[PDB]
Ligand binder design. Sequence first.
Ligand SMILES: C[n+]1cn([C@@H]2O[C@H](COP(=O)(O)OP(=O)(O)OP(=O)(O)O)[C@@H](O)[C@H]2O)c2nc(N)[nH]c(=O)c21
Ligand SMILES: [Mg+2]
Length: 215
Amino acid sequence: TEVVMENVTAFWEEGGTPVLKDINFKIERGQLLAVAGSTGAGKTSLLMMIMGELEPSEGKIKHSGRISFCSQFSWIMPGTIKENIIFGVSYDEYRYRSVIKACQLEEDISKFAEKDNIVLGEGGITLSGGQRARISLARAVYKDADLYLLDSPFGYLDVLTEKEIFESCVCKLMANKTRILVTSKMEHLKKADKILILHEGSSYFYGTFSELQNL
Ligand SMILES: C[n+]1cn([C@@H]2O[C@H](COP(=O)(O)OP(=O)(O)OP(=O)(O)O)[C@@H](O)[C@H]2O)c2nc(N)[nH]c(=O)c21
Ligand SMILES: [Mg+2]
């Protein structure tokens, strides 16, 4: 197993309301876990526990190795689009190009005369929300890691572009990698190896899409 939570409960504030309550799941190496639930359900807080930023008050957690995290809030730093995606990791042309194709960024980049050297974050280009989201996702996917934590990464995308990038990036390009994707979309839940739906900190459902259909 690469990631396990067993009977996990946690609090952000000593003696507040628990942000996660008796949570259970397991992901084997290379699988995809979909994490769903309404705002404030605890999805980002669950990822923070995996990243060691929130400690359990009850229960056990297993994970090892390097993490790459994609925030639900896209961001860019001053530098070229290539520098933003590689973000300090060593460069490889094939890997970089594979990521930007999987993220549909090749189309955007081909329209600038400076191509991958277009400068972001310095008052020239103002990117759209969807462009900034795809760059943020590409940054997280380019990094080599044992576990990818993708927190609602499809912000501002129309539903067909979201579907296409889910399929080319999260399912195909990342097929061999352990992934946790925070997402609400039916096709993502259907393609995941497991689904965890959170509601106000609790496990509303944990199992497969097939199991849920049989209910
Ligand atoms: C991300 N985060 C959330 N909280 C609070 O933890 C509770 C669960 O908040 P959440 O951010 O985990 O919910 P979720 O990611 O499901 O919501 P969404 O992104 O809108 O879809 C809420 O009370 C937050 O205010 C947080 N509280 C502290 N103290 N530190 C944090 O980093 C933090
Ligand atoms: Mg969140």
